[PDB]
Amino acid sequence: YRVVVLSFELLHAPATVCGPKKSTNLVKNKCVNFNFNGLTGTGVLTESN
């Protein structure tokens, strides 16, 4: 039996192995349901210092 096992860590910054989903542009200052490399949530994206 040819056995191949996959191992990967989760919730980390260097996301160079990822899926085929299409990226969209930012809107800023709007209540949106964003997603960042699998990290998703509902909120408003603004600037920062």
Partner 1 sequence: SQILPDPSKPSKRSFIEDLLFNKVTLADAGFIKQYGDCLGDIAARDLICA
| Residue number, 23 or 48, with CB nearest to partner 1 | 48
Residue 9: Cβ within 10 Å count: 5
| Residue number, 28 or 37, with CB nearest to partner 1 | 28
Pairwise CA distance, residues 23 & 11, whole Å: 19
Which helix or strand (DSSP H or E) is residue 49 part of? none
Least distance to partner 1, CB of residue 48, Å: 11
Which residue in the set 29, 40, 48, 49 belongs to the binding site for partner 1 (CB under 8 A)? 29
Pairwise CA distance, residues 28 & 47, whole Å: 8
* Residues found near partner 1 in the complex (CB under 8 A): 29, 44, 46
